Design a protein around this ligand. Structure first.
Ligand SMILES: Nc1ccn(C[C@@H](CO)OCP(=O)(O)OP(=O)(O)OP(=O)(O)O)c(=O)n1
Ligand SMILES: [Ca+2]
Ligand SMILES: [Ca+2]
Ligand SMILES: [Ca+2]
Lengths: 1005, 218, 419
DNA sequence: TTTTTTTGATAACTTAATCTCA
DNA sequence: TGAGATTAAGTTAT
């Protein structure tokens, strides 16, 4: 088809196995191309002639070197050189699988081999020539030499795409829709064809409606069709029977759409539609290969992913659709759950988290409330997204607590103008979100009417359009294209594999470019190794500006600096006593000078050893550093793309992509220390961690107690390289561009892996920011070296450090001033945790703010603060226990279900199993659910708590707190009191209050 | 050896006392599906549904599991056919007659062997086509396999891809062997050395060895 | 599924059958195989073990201290020696009773055990007894052969065995003290054997019998006796000159024997043995002070700190005496067997074995020191922590560090030329 | 009428249940 | 009937 652009790649699963490509031309027609797919093996030239059945095809790979990357322990300096052998290699293609004994490079996929050897990118535009193409069908072509056909690549051009965003609503009586006894009531489609037309249509099962209701609807303008051929997609509401509804659904699902998008539809929607189709009629949803040679029926299959820590077990489950027509069936639930961390993963929660804006009060009313939004009220792009979602939206949440029905809406040229139904809130600026509703589907189905049918149709089409809104908001198309380009994978499996698989494409490309093969023979023994270093905090409250300096990509840059690769490791030298250790050190300092070799002092891997030195060669760049350089370049490009964005959605997408690439770069290191990986390297991981610890220690030592005065800055220690002598000035007296009247002193107070918190004896925000910028400029050229670079993160105020990894503060960004509004940030405290409470966090915030203000103004003439704080705690707790005005939602906990446990009697197993055995709603193997402590109401306040887990019950979606059941407030109150006690200074009153209220000993940090 | 009745053709739930915590849920699991199950003609005998649920299950140590009864004809118990013609049973019998050392036989009838029980995952089929009743029996098969696994020590299943998702199907860990079906191309079941595996597993789990040639019928 | 899995798990079952007769390597292999089995099959009937106490009482009946009636079968007689007991399960080291200590076999005993066990597979294990730096053929439990032919083959391979006598008894004769004395006299075997354990044909389990009389005696003195090159054995004397044998130094340490104090000692017809089961830091220095400062506890025995030079190096390398380094290199390169052994061993280990120092004590002493090393040779050493000097053995070893460093420098210099 | 491709690391804190010791 | 230590699980920072 000459100028075509690829959309998806898929394989044939018949007796004659083929590979297929779906592409689109500039005009808009679809072209399918077929290839014979083989099994690829790599052999040596000597082995190639020793094959009794001659290979079907063989291509010379040239001369490549094979290197053994097994690691051995040496007790002396007599280290034998690594075994490497250079030989000519052959890539052989077999129509059927073979069993060659001495075959290498066997960890790569066959589709990866096809892509890399044929020089074809999964996504791209090509000029296919007709010499290598023959017609086998109307639109389907056959190619025998994909290498020569794809020799011409052209710049990317835009193409039309087809979308089917679908949702269904099934009647349910008491518990859950059952495909054997409960029918489908509503089916809403957002249909986008290659012409760009966007048609929204909802089909309503008429067998649930009375004849008079059908007449009323058809008079109002609802089409009442009788057969498949009488259906038009240009109408909004179509009344039909269930059989005709299912036939229309099957007809739509059999079309060659580019994308068929659902939210949890692979597990519920598509399965329900299919099973009903075979139950009522007996027909099948037939998928066909492009050449019309092999046909399959729709059958959703389950894919289980196991863990990799402490007895693997099942960890997650996904559901997929089998089809051989090139259509991608996408479920947004799995994509959002894999890529985001949230308290809940329901549609309402994600919509509320994503679709929010700030509204300005413009009118009031007896029961109404008019809002407005634009670029002046909130950030740029929020109002446009809110208006786009508001086209089908019905309910709006105000202040994250009030759910209000939309009375009237008006889309403007810059924002929105919506009037709600809520009391007169006496403020000027509020927050509007698209979240939970106040509709009881169980009650509506029991009193089903025409108006309720129309309301359900509106809600269903809103959900179908929410699928599209989340598709556009998360940049799934852009992410898919980027993943296919980077990982060298078909578009249908970009978000299906973890780091162990998505790096094999670039790894194979790098290995072929460098002409290297890595082999291992010996077994891999596992030993623990030490991680990063965390400094103990010196104070809880500081009342001074703290300057934060953070290393950029610490571990990838450490690996690049040290050339840490399994094939570049010279050896490991261990010692048992001090005599041998000293002799080995004397020999080693002169045998391997450090312009070329680097020696890392690691902790011994065995108790009998007292020393362990890992030697690395930096003459030749390693395999891991090149991959890390590639990924850092990708992340830098995506950061540059992020910084040149003005819309909120584009900024969010770019931030997510750069975070994903940073996590990929980190996972490269993590896999370098993963036993079940091909790139396993215990010594490399130990060396990287040790070098990181040395770097953070060096930064902390040089920054602690480094005063400045006049035009000079004096560092604590000499600017000397912590690994070997280098050609840099070590004088800690540095000329600074700051004016002559500045005099301040610094003191290191905390550290974590690569972050250093340095306080300054100052309070002026502009002064602190200027000094921090100057210092960050100064400690990147005179202090650091090679590729080690740090950046000034922010200025922290009112820093309250509870522990070594939990602290809350107010953040001033690098580009800010005194008048700039701070941002409140919490790291590890009981406010970002997903399983503490909602009632807990608000009180924690209020009490922490009050304590910060009260310490800032000046107090502590006596016990003082403790008395009033504990009195307030007692009053609030007794008021909550008596009134019980808080809802059940404020006392809800979240936990993830999984089957990775040491014992089968674990209470977490029992709770989920018992819930599943008595509830039609089944919690999957990676589903996050809700639970809470509920106790009999007649039970009074309990002093000594004995059993806690026995009171846990799962609040799925509709649990009702009965008269006999009440929230067991004791656990929450005890946790809140225990957290608050550790914040205060005086103790005797704290233990006294804990004994009086509960009757235990409060643990102190 | 008791029984319970339901409102659907089979309504012949003769069951043993050791199968007690099964029927009380199987009744609801089968009532909602019997109406659509009995509308078609199957190829077990309809009365041969709850026939292996009256046997004592705390006597067997190894369980061999089938995925589907024979697409043509059928008796009611897996891997039994006193009309010996089929290829799968031929391949099963050849590799065990070679192991035991008996050359003269008139079938195997693996059911009669003490210490082992043949199991069918899907309790019904249809004439001509296989795996045509999976939806009607999925949850019932799950519950029955879970109960059988809870009592036996080792489970044997036929079909690699057909039983590729059995670990998540059961919540209680158990010794499981998934063997190749004796109908694939190249006759891979000949290379399948699994009977020795299950036997030596019984000795490794301090269980009484089970004689294997006992079931031969002359 | 496959043959490899079958072989692996049947080897796991075989290892499970012999669980008490295991060492560190076998425990690690068993754990690895259990992990592989439970990962592949999702469940395994056996679990992990980490303690593994060595027990032999499951193959031996309760001890007998009373005349008893016997008549079953033949009466192959086998005495029991006095001393430490070691177990050779299959291709392993020597396992001590209780704690799974790994004894250091010199060379010939391990080869003899391997050659004896390679003949068949029906033998449960091989039992050895060590007394004053010598081995003896103990009971040979076996489920296939009678122990007579195992004894004969072990004797002809090169190790020593006790004599055996077979007698047929018709009626239930009352074995008494007189029969025990007569058969121990007929055994000759001047080595101080304590008990006698006769086998029973047909009955797999063996039986042990010994007769003794309690006695109380007085302690005169404790003295060391030479039984080798710097290997000393403790001993005591009585007023009448009677000798009370002690199996090893640990027996004396646990007994807490006090000078000029009455003790309980088990007396027999020929010789008598002190009885155990009567802190450690007090005795470990008190006995050292009484016997002499110039002594230390070399593991199971006593060793004397003295001179260390060319004579010790020649003795340890099994070469004749010489004068200079050139004669050393010539005499150790003349035969290619010794030089290969020297190449495979480090300077530190070779010097430590030449001076006969302990392993753990010397390692701790070295790790609690500071050294100045030039040209791969030691010229200055000093103590950084004096706490480790509290142990008298550490002080005794440190008192002669000059000889050790001289030997270390000589070995380093000669290895610089042997390559 | 049945069958190829998976799996990043450690450090630090909090709470409940179990084991051990006055 | 308390105190103290230890292990397993969940979750976050880096
Ligand atoms: N997913 C992660 C996250 C963190 N770390 C530890 C360490 C090295 O990756 O974090 C140091 P940085 O250089 O990645 O720094 P940080 O995580 O703060 O990223 P940055 O601010 O540079 O985007 C890790 O190993 N894996
Ligand atoms: Ca839905
Ligand atoms: Ca919906
Ligand atoms: Ca960083």
């Amino acid at each position: 088809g000459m100028d075509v652009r690829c959309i998806n790649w898929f394989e044939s699963h018949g007796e004659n196995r083929f590979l297929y490509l779906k592409s689109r031309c500039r005009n808009g027609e679809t072209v399918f191309i077929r290839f014979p797919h083989y099994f690829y093996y790599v052999v040596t030239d000597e082995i190639y002639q020793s094959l009794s059945p001659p290979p079907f095809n063989a291509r010379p790979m040239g001369k490549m070197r094979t290197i053994d990357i097994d690691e051995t322990i040496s007790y002396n300096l007599d280290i034998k050189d690594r075994k490497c052998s250079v030989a000519d290699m052959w890539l052989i293609e077999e129509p059927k699988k073979r069993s060659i004994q001495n075959a290498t490079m066997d960890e790569f996929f066959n589709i990866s081999w096809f892509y890399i050897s044929n020089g074809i990118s999964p996504d791209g535009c090509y000029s296919l020539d007709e010499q290598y193409l023959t017609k086998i069908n109307n639109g389907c072509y056959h190619c025998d030499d994909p290498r020569n056909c794809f020799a011409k690549e052209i710049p990317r051009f835009d193409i039309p795409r087809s979308y089917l965003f679908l949702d269904i609503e099934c009647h349910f009586d008491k518990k859950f829709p059952s495909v054997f006894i409960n029918p489908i009531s509503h089916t809403s489609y957002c249909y986008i064809d290659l012409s760009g037309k966007r048609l929204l249509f909802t089909l309503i099962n008429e067998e649930m409606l009375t004849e008079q209701e059908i007449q009323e609807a058809v008079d109002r303008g609802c089409l009442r069709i009788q057969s498949l051929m009488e259906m038009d997609y240009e109408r909004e509401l179509v009344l039909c029977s269930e059989i005709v509804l299912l036939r229309i659904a099957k007809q739509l699902l059999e079309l060659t759409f580019d994308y068929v998008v659902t939210f949890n539809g692979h597990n519920f929607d598509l399965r329900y539609i299919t099973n009903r189709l075979e139950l009522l009629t007996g027909e099948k949803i037939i998928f066909r290969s492009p050449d019309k040679k092999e046909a399959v029926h729709l059958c959703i299959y389950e894919r289980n992913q196991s863990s990799h820590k402490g007895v693997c077990g099942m960890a997650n489950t996904t559901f997929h659709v089998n089809n051989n027509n090139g259509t991608i069936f996408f479920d947004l639930y799995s994509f959002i759950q894999k890529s985001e961390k949230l308290d809940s993963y329901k549609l309402d929660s994600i919509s509320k988290n994503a679709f929010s804006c700030m509204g300005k009060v413009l009118n009031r009313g007896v029961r109404e409330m008019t809002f407005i939004g634009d670029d002046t009220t909130d950030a740029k792009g929020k109002a446009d997204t809110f208006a786009k979602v508001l086209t089908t939206g019905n309910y709006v949440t105000v202040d994250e607590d009030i759910i209000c029905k939309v009375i009237r809406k008006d889309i403007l040229e810059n924002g929105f103008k919506v009037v709600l139904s809520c009391p007169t809130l006496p403020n000027d600026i509020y927050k509007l979100s698209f979240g939970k509703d106040d509709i009881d589907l169980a009650q509506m189905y029991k009193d089903y009417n025409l108006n309720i049918a129309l309301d359900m149709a509106r809600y269903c089409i809103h959900d179908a359009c929410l699928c599209q809104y989340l598709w556009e908001y998360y940049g799934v198309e852009t992410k898919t294209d980027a993943g296919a380009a980077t990982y060298v994978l078909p578009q249908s499996m970009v978000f299906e594999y973890r780091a162990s698989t998505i790096i094999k494409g670039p790894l194979l490309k790098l290995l072929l470019e460098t002409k290297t093969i890595l082999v291992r023979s010996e077994t891999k023994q596992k030993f623990p190794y030490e991680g990063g270093k965390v400094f103990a905090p010196k104070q809880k409250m500081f009342s001074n500006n703290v300057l934060i300096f953070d290393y950029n990509s610490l571990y990838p840059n450490v690996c690049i600096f040290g050339n840490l690769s399994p094939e570049t490791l010279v050896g490991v030298v261990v010692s048992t006593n001090r005599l041998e250790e000293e002799i080995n050190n004397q020999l080693l300092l002169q045998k391997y000078p450090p312009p070329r070799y680097i020696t890392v002092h690691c902790e011994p891997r065995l108790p009998n050893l007292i020393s362990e030195i890992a030697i690395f060669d930096r003459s030749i760049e390693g395999t891991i550093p090149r991959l890390l350089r590639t990924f850092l370049a990708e992340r830098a490009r995506y950061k540059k793309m992020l910084k040149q964005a003005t819309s909120s959605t584009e900024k969010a997408i770019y931030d997510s992509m750069q975070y994903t690439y940073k996590i990929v770069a980190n996972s490269v290191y993590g896999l370098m220390g993963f036993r079940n990986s091909a790139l396993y390297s215990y010594a490399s991981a130990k060396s990287c961690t040790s070098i990181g610890r040395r770097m953070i220690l060096y930064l902390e030592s040089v920054l602690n107690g480094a005063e400045l005065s006049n035009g000079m800055l004096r560092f604590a220690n000499t600017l000397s390289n912590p690994f070997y002598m280098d050609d840099r000035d070590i004088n800690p007296i540095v000329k600074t561009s700051l004016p002559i009247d500045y005099r301040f002193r610094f003191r290191s107070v905390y550290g974590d892996t690569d972050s250093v918190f340095t306080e300054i004896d100052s309070q002026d925000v502009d002064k602190s920011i200027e000094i921090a910028k100057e210092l960050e400029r100064l400690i990147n050229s005179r202090v650091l070296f090679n590729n080690f670079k740090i950046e000034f993160e922010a200025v922290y105020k009112n820093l309250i450090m509870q522990s070594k990894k939990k602290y809350t503060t107010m953040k001033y960004s690098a580009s800010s001033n005194s008048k700039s509004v701070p941002e409140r940030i919490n790291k590890g405290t009981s406010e970002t945790r997903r399983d503490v409470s909602k009632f807990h966090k608000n009180m924690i915030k209020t009490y922490k703010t009050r304590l910060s203000e009260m310490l800032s103004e000046g107090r502590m003439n006596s016990n003082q603060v403790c008395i009033d704080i504990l009195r307030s705690l007692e009053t609030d707790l007794r008021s909550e226990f008596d009134s019980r005005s808080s809802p059940l939602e404020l006392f809800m906990l979240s936990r993830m279900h999984h089957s990775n446990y040491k014992s089968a009697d674990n209470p977490n197993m029992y709770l989920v199993t018992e819930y599943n055995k008595n509830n039609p709603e089944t919690i999957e193997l990676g589903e996050r659910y809700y639970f809470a402590y509920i106790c009999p109401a007649n039970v009074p306040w309990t002093k000594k708590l004995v059993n806690i887990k026995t009171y846990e019950t799962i609040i799925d979606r509709s649990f009702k707190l009965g008269s006999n059941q009440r929230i067991f407030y004791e656990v929450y109150f005890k946790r809140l009191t225990s957290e608050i006690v550790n914040l205060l200074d005086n103790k005797v009153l704290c233990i006294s209050f804990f004994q009086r209220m509960f009757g235990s000993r409060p643990t102190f940090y | 050896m008791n029984s319970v009745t339901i409102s659907h053709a089979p309504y012949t739930i003769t069951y043993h006392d050791d199968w007690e915590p099964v029927m009380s849920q199987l009744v609801e699991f089968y009532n909602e599906v019997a109406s659509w199950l009995l509308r078609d003609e199957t190829s077990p005998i309809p009365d041969k549904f709850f026939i292996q649920l009256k046997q004592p299950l705390r006597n067997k140590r190894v369980c061999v599991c089938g995925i589907d009864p024979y697409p043509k004809d059928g008796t009611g118990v897996p891997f039994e056919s006193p009309n010996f013609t089929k290829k799968s049973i031929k391949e099963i019998a050849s590799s065990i007659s070679r192991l035991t050392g008996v050359i003269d036989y008139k079938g195997y009838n693996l059911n009669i062997i003490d210490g082992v029980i043949p199991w069918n995952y899907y309790l019904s089929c249809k004439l001509g086509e296989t795996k045509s009743h999976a939806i009607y029996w999925d949850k019932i098969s799950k519950l029955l396999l879970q109960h059988i696994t809870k009592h036996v020590s080792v489970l044997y299943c036929l079909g690699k891809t057909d039983f590729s998702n059995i670990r998540a199907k059961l919540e209680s860990p158990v010794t499981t062997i998934v063997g190749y079906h004796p109908a694939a191309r190249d006759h891979q079941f000949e290379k399948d050395r699994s009977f020795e595996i299950i036997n030596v597993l019984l000795e490794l789990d301090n269980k009484t060895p089970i004689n294997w040639a006992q079931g031969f019928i002359y | 599924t496959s043959s490899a899995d079958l072989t692996n798990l049947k080897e796991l079952l075989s290892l499970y059958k012999s669980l008490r007769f295991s060492d560190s390597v076998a425990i690690e292999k068993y754990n690895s195989l259990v992990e592989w089995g439970t990962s592949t099959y999702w469940k395994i009937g056996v679990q992990k073990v980490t303690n593994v106490e060595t027990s032999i009482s499951d193959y031996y009946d309760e001890v007998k201290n009373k005349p008893f009636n016997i008549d079953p079968g033949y009466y192959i007689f086998l005495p029991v020696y006095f001393g430490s007991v070691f177990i050779y399960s299959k291709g392993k080291n020597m396992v001590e009773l209780g704690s799974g200590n790994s004894f250091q076999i010199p060379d010939e005993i391990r080869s003899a055990c391997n050659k004896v066990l390679d003949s068949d597979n029906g033998i449960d294990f091989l039992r050895f007894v060590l007394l004053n730096n010598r081995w003896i053929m103990e009971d040979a439990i076996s489920k296939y052969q009678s122990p007579v032919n195992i004894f004969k083959l072990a004797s002809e391979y090169g190790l020593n065995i006790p004599n055996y006598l077979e007698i047929e008894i018709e009626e239930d004769t009352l074995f008494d003290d007189e029969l025990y004395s007569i058969m121990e006299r007929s055994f000759d075997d001047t080595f101080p054997k304590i008990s006698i354990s006769y086998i029973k044909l047909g009955e797999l389990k063996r039986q042990v019998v010994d007769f003794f009389k309690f006695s109380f005696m007085y302690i005169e003195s404790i003295k060391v006796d030479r039984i080798g090159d710097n290997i000393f054995i403790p001993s005591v004397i009585t007023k009448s000159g009677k000798k009370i044998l002690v199996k090893d130094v640990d027996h004396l340490i646990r007994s807490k024997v006090r000078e000029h104090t009455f003790v309980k000692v088990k007396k027999k017809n020929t010789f008598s043995i002190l009885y155990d089961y009567d802190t450690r830091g007090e005795v470990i220095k008190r006995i050292i002070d009484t016997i002499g400062r110039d002594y230390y506890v070399n593991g199971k025995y006593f060793s004397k700190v003295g001179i260390a030079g060319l004579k010790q190096l020649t003795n340890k390398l099994d070469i004749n005496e010489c004068a200079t380094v050139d004669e050393l290199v010539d005499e150790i390169n003349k035969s290619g067997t010794v030089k290969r052994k020297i190449k495979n061993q480090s300077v530190f280990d070779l010097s430590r074995e030449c001076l006969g120092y302990p392993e753990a004590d010397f390692i701790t002493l070295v790790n609690n020191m500071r050294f100045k090393i030039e040209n791969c040779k030691v010229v200055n050493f000093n103590i950084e922590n004096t706490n480790c000097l509290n142990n008298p053995s550490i002080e005794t070893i440190y008192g002669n560090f000059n000889q050790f460093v001289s030997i270390f420098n000589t070995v380093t210099d000669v290895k610089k030329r042997l390559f």
